[PDB]
Amino acid sequence: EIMCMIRDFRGSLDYRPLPIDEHRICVCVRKRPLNKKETQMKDLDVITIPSKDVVMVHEPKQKVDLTRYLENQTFRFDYAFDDSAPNEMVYRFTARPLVETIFERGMATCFAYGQTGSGKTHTMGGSKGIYALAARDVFLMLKKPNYKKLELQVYATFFEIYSGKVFDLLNRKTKLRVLEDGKQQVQVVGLQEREVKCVEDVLKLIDIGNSCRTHSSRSHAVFQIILRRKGKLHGKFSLIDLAGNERDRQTRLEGAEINKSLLALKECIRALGRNKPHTPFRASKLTQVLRDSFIGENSRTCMIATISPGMASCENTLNTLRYANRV
Ligand SMILES: Nc1ncnc2c1ncn2[C@@H]1O[C@H](COP(=O)(O)OP(=O)(O)O)[C@@H](O)[C@H]1O
Numbered sequence: 001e002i003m004c005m006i007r008d009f010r011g012s013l014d015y016r017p018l019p020i021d022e023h024r025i026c027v028c029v030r031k032r033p034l035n036k037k038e039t040q041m042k043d044l045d046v047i048t049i050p051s052k053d054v055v056m057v058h059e060p061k062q063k064v065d066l067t068r069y070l071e072n073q074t075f076r077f078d079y080a081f082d083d084s085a086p087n088e089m090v091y092r093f094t095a096r097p098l099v100e101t102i103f104e105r106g107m108a109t110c111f112a113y114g115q116t117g118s119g120k121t122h123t124m125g126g127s128k129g130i131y132a133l134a135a136r137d138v139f140l141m142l143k144k145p146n147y148k149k150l151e152l153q154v155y156a157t158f159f160e161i162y163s164g165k166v167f168d169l170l171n172r173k174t175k176l177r178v179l180e181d182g183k184q185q186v187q188v189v190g191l192q193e194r195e196v197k198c199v200e201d202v203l204k205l206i207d208i209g210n211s212c213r214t215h216s217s218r219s220h221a222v223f224q225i226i227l228r229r230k231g232k233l234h235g236k237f238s239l240i241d242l243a244g245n246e247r248d249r250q251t252r253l254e255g256a257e258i259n260k261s262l263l264a265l266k267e268c269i270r271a272l273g274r275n276k277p278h279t280p281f282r283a284s285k286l287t288q289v290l291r292d293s294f295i296g297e298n299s300r301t302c303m304i305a306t307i308s309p310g311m312a313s314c315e316n317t318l319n320t321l322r323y324a325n326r327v
Pocket residue numbers: 031032033035083114115116117118119120121122123126217306
């Protein structure tokens with residue numbers, strides 16, 4: 001009944017799924033498919049991405065006279081990825097253009113933002129996750145004649161921000177202090193920086209930090225790819241798998257700290273587009289550590305808003321699209 005109403009509406013859509021456009025700030029949405037449990041649990045798919053560009057939310061509702069209808073809210077982003085877009089498709093329009101940024105000596109960031117279960121970690125971490133696909137392209141760019149002559153070295157860090165504090169995912173969640181005030185470069189004191197020479201070196205670090213992290217839904221994981229000349233910084237790509245945006249004492253603290261930081265993040269990304277001097281990067285630990293990825297002269301950012309398609313997730317989806325729409 002509700003399912004027919006949905007099928008009858010999709011049948012009217014012109015499916016034109018996803019040529020790279022340049023954005024200083026790139027905001028995108030990615031729908032994940034219904035999983036094997038949801039599929040046998042009868043649950044319904046309330047989200048359609050018919051176009052390169054467009055997200056449709058069509059929530060089934062029923063009136064007091066028993067009339068059923070679809071509550072249709074449409075959102076427009078730089079890109080939208082349907083539930084069968086693979087990681088490499090998503091990567092191409094998002095993190096891939098930013099790899100050139102860091103060789104041109106810029107600071108790049110890529111955030112995965114959305115509810116727990118929606119696909120942030122699938123997108124960023126997982127050989128087919130965004131950390132690794134970027135790492136691949138970094139080592140390939142490095143062989144190009146412009147960059148071959150530079151004597152560049154590549155390093156990686158993997159850390160988390162949990163409850164307003166930093167912990168090293170490459171060193172057993174050891175708590176680290178951050179020194180920001182008056183420093184030319186923000187210093188995360190004691191943070192393990194590891195030289196990597198191929199994708200395989202990076203996959204090992206991602207595997208290590210992920211099992212350290214896993215709590216994984218209540219912290220931001222930051223993976224960094226760092227270019228260095230002679231120990232001197234050439235560029236940095238920071239890749240962020242954010243804490244779930246969905247909203248006892250420890251639990252309330254984590255959520256208050258998460259949401260504080262997502263407000264700060266939005267303001268900082270917007271400052272990056274309009275007014276870098278007015279970047280409120282001190283509003284959270286997440287944005288403080290990344291100060292220089294918002295205020296640097298050649299700073300570029302990307303956000304992938306991940307959404308679950310289920311009717312039961314609908315309110316959460318709308319909150320995610322709303323926030324992404326306002327960045
Ligand atoms: N686009 C996708 N295609 C296939 N499976 C996915 C996709 N996105 C997420 N999943 C799967 O759904 C589950 C939850 O995803 P995850 O990325 O762990 O969510 P989050 O990090 O947002 O909590 C995992 O089992 C993951 O493999």
